[model samples]
Target: HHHHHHMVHITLDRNTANSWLIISKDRRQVRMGDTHQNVSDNKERFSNYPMVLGAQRFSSGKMYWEVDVTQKEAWDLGVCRDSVQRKGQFSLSPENGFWTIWLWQDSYEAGTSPQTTLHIQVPPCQIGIFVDYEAGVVSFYNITDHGSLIYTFSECVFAGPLRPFFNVGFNYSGGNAAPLKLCPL
Candidate 1:
């Protein structure tokens, strides 16, 4: 079913990224930088969270993309509404226009209303994300395990354009320095 959907190329948007994030020149990989970069202020930038958004925005379509998380200890992945709050602290849940899954301390979770914990038989080295805009569904697949599903958010409410979301979770002084690599299709 997902095979028919087109796999789109997604790149990180420098303007929507936090100062502490180090986005590669190709904008296909991101990680926590040693120091925050001093760039001109932009309302679209993430001033608080260590996160980034995709340069391309989606309004309607069935799209798929893969990300390599191989040795990453902590990270966040999913899609968020384009108008989501960019300043200050906010909850990373669908209620706030964020439908994402994250991994931390070897535990995986979905950012739902109350947060859903995911138990997997095998850790995913690379994750596949499928978004059916018209169907209001966003699903995550464990590519490392033959594309077995890890979680899905159904009946999602999309009010506007959506951007690929990523957060280089709490860096432990470079302990979690593995870059989040966007797999080429």
Candidate 2:
């Protein structure tokens, strides 16, 4: 039997004052799943696997943005203002995997935004993320047990002109047995 591993696909486009971050299956939405929860916690919860898509626009001053994957206890993935070398960065939790892509910015902080904070449980599956800063889009996907595309975001948007660098980070908050795995996409 041929089994397929769940993978997340993302596309980015840059325009005058808008960017587009599209995910596989659909565009302009954030979809995530929890392996542990039988029912979905929320349509846009960052539990198991969730994607963020939109334009880069935030206050020039030090702004803190973070997503809480404490439910899944796996990793937290995000994009920053620049690459790993620069500054103003975003990161996933339990860092350790085969994922690369970091940017720099003026300053970076951790914490969830009241409007963008999601808490959900994570299944025993891999988490996929797609980010396109220039285009202003980010996406998330839920890979099946065997690593096959299951669900995706349809309408996710990044609003503003933050000019963040594209990056994919992983964290092993799920303890030693459930560490997040960062693979090439």
Candidate 3:
């Protein structure tokens, strides 16, 4: 259930993407890079994290976007505060400024402070994300299942603007070597 005024367009922010991650020219597709990157360390650019942030910011209102994670065994996609740490490995929890839902090796996990396990089997190739900034809530929908509600994070405190986050797994055994496409709605 989405209102037209609630939806906003989003794209991968290349400046926020880790060097080892490949970003499309349109900034809508992201995947593990072909090989390790020799890029220098920077304060804003992600170093240890194999992730990327969206260019679109959500300060208020409901924001909706969809992703095509087909053919990938694992991926992490959700929203995070602009203040989330970007230089080191950290927990994907609200306490750490992240509210996310991910599929790792076919296992689903909601990025709560302590993280939440989801019993729903298999990963949703197509995922719809809804973030109500004012409501301080982020919901993940299984678009592969005809837009069925999957997992949600409530009681979220919007300390600041949130942006779309993506982690398309590692290219272990070439299992994570695929583009996480942003579906055109």
Candidate 4:
């Protein structure tokens, strides 16, 4: 009989402000914190971190990741809330105010890349983000391919912010899924 196991679920809140999901260069594991104590195992690094015209994570919600493209042009990738509060009130601009996914091509002198914003609207649920540098693009996919592209960043180094907050959970469909084990930094 074929055995099936459920995927893992993770939730991110304001407390996750400084948190991020760290994947090794090999893409073998996914770490929840900077130290790598809470690591999740996986098989294919490409599967967990798919690289294509557009790469996206397999889960949902707000998440973040940093790339080290010091050797090449720097790229910025992350998500932001739809409406940002300023002094206990919402900011101006309603049409432009929405949770957004962003990617930017930046100059090394700026310390990071510029921000190119992408708006994402779903039922306030979790979502995953995947980034592949070799392929020269970043994409956001749904829990599964849902016919539309979530987000994409191209022709840039996936560098900046060593840690990114992934509001969505991690799925280990690949047999090689392994935890991102780490030691104290």
Winner by TM-score between candidate 4 and candidate 1: 1
lDDT of 2 at 160: 35
**For all the candidates, what are their Cα RMSDs to the real structure?**
1.3, 17.1, 1.7, 17.3
Which lDDT values do the candidates have, in the order given? 0.89, 0.29, 0.81, 0.29
The best-first sequence of candidates by TM-score reads: 1, 3, 2, 4
Over 34-149, each residue of candidate 1 has an lDDT whose tens digit, in order, gives: 78787777899988878999998999989999999877889999999999999998989987899999998879999987888997899999999999999999999998888888
Model 1 steric clash pairs: none
Tens-place lDDT per residue, model 3, 38-150, is 66656778778689899887788878888998988877889888888998788888888888888776578898757788866545788888988777788888877777788
Q: What's the true lDDT of residue 63 in model 1? A: 90
lDDT of 3: 0.81
lDDT of 4 at 74: 17
**Best candidate per TM-score, number?**
1
**Could you estimate the TM-score for every candidate?**
0.95, 0.29, 0.92, 0.27
1-185: candidate 2 lDDT, tens digit per residue? 12223223332212210111223232222222222323333332222222232344432332222222222332234443321222123333212111221211212222222113232233424444444434443444334333333222223233333322222222233331221223444
lDDT of 2 at 32: 29
lDDT assessment of candidate 1: 0.89
Worst 10 residues of 2 by lDDT: 13-22
